[PDB]
Amino acid sequence: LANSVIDLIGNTPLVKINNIDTFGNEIYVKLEGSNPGRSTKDRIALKMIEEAEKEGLIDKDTVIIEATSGNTGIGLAMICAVKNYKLKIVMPDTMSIERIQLMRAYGTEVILTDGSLGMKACLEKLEELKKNEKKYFVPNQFTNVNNPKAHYETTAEEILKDLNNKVDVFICGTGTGGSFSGTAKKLKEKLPNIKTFPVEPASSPLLSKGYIGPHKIQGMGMSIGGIPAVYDGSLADDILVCEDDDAFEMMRELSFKEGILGGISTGATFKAALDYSKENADKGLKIVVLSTDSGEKYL
Amino acid sequence: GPLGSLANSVIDLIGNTPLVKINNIDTFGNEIYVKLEGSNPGRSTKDRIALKMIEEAEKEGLIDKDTVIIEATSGNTGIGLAMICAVKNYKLKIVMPDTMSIERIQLMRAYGTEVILTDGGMKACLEKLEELKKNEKKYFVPNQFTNVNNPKAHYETTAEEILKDLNNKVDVFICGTGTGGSFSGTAKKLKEKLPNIKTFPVEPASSPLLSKGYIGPHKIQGMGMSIGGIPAVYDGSLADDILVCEDDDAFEMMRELSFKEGILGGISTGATFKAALDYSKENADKGLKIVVLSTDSGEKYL
């Protein structure tokens, strides 16, 4: 049994890659698309909310407000449905329309900003909305320690247990930097020799080249006006990148060859991982790729 | 470790779907548990039947590495087959009309399916199906409507999971029907282990074939039969009664489940759940343990 969909968050499957040539290393994909909200962001939605509740920051009529690229809004929408909280999301109009439709299916109210101004414009508009709300809580995923902490506590522990502590490499897409940073932090505390790499869009190479740009790898990229506080760059053994088209193409390779329907960021992160494997061919490495969301919302 | 989720392929993710208790919607003093078949990696219960139909055919020798799998279907069965065939490297052709959603067409194509489009009735699909058979040296047609591996998969897995998760404490099972396989396979097994259990199929109120002997238009995707006729895999001798749901109520309940429970099920989940609520209300405060099958997740209908 589960008492609610909240009990289904986490404990996601880790699936071996069998048909794609992985160059004498084993690649496993952690399917965060299996979460009830269809993304890893269910984990951070749950922890940011539950810790706020414990700290006395959320009453039953507190309005939760958050700027999001989409999946955090979906995870929050779903949790707020179960908990009967009111959620308002500020988001860019440039994201997949399926994100909006998913949030609205859970009863979430969406306010739209100009996508060409990035997540900075969402964070700005959220300040304006605060003035009309008598009682609110802003999870603030780009600074809230409970974003990476969720991954440190659950995601990483699931990887360690499922692979019985045999993990050589962990590769993960970045937006807030929380899933990479929290998971890599725990992994490195237990496995001192593990290598952990973040991936960013080749068209918005903030970490590897020092500038941003438009890209199509939804959920990835840093557009708040700097590197998020929750990103811990000291954990990165190197910065990996992926082009927009290669991400789309790899997303299709995964579905055609593995029956894995991941998002565009999954295509990006997996491409980066497969390239890494090719560069480190025939070492018998156990390589784990975080698939941040499922692909249904991008078709 | 023993309670971990390491998987060899997405095939290992099929089945073992969770039961979730309903807490916020009034269920009238009975306990309603929804079995979320949307948790399957192809997002519906049809992964179970796609898996069993293909694997039994492999075992029979009906599928060689170069056998083309061919099925005339516009629904979740096509998706389930597509995903399975992606993993197993079989060529799949799915025949469906001109007039179907890009939603499902694109999902099937994402797994590598050749979707062949005809003119929208089903009669024109069958002639294309016959034409493709004639063009292929080797083929296998699963035929979800006649293949006993449809209900057998549910008899073997779906029903056993329900018994295990509720420690054999199940009073009522309610399930939407299209092929009738999930209802008939699951109810068969549950009744063998639990002789007092009541088992009810649900059909669309505006296509009440089983309850009133005719077909009509409805919007409960995945449910409903054709004439055509009642599929071979439906076993009406298991049905304690036939329940129905109108289109409007199915959509409303779909919305209610996502708003109040954070459960995003398909239209048939709304229909089946509405039928179970109407049943639970006629039997209020009996502490009945009622299981509803949620056949797919709701994303594709948004």
Ligand SMILES: *Cc1c(COP(=O)(O)O)cnc(C)c1O
């Ligand atoms: C948020 C998100 C990411 C990046 O994850 P972070 O933990 O924020 O760095 C990648 N892909 C998708 C689809 C996302 O929603």
Ligand SMILES: *Cc1c(COP(=O)(O)O)cnc(C)c1O
């Ligand atoms: C196939 C399907 C049904 C009906 O299930 P059967 O086992 O064919 O009777 C109900 N809902 C959806 C979404 C389906 O795809």
Ligand SMILES: [Ca+2]
């Ligand atoms: Ca240590």
Ligand SMILES: [Ca+2]
């Ligand atoms: Ca190092």
Ligand SMILES: [Ca+2]
């Ligand atoms: Ca390119």
Ligand SMILES: [Ca+2]
């Ligand atoms: Ca009551």
Ligand SMILES: [Ca+2]
């Ligand atoms: Ca045999």
Ligand SMILES: [Ca+2]
């Ligand atoms: Ca193929």
Ligand SMILES: [Ca+2]
């Ligand atoms: Ca193909």
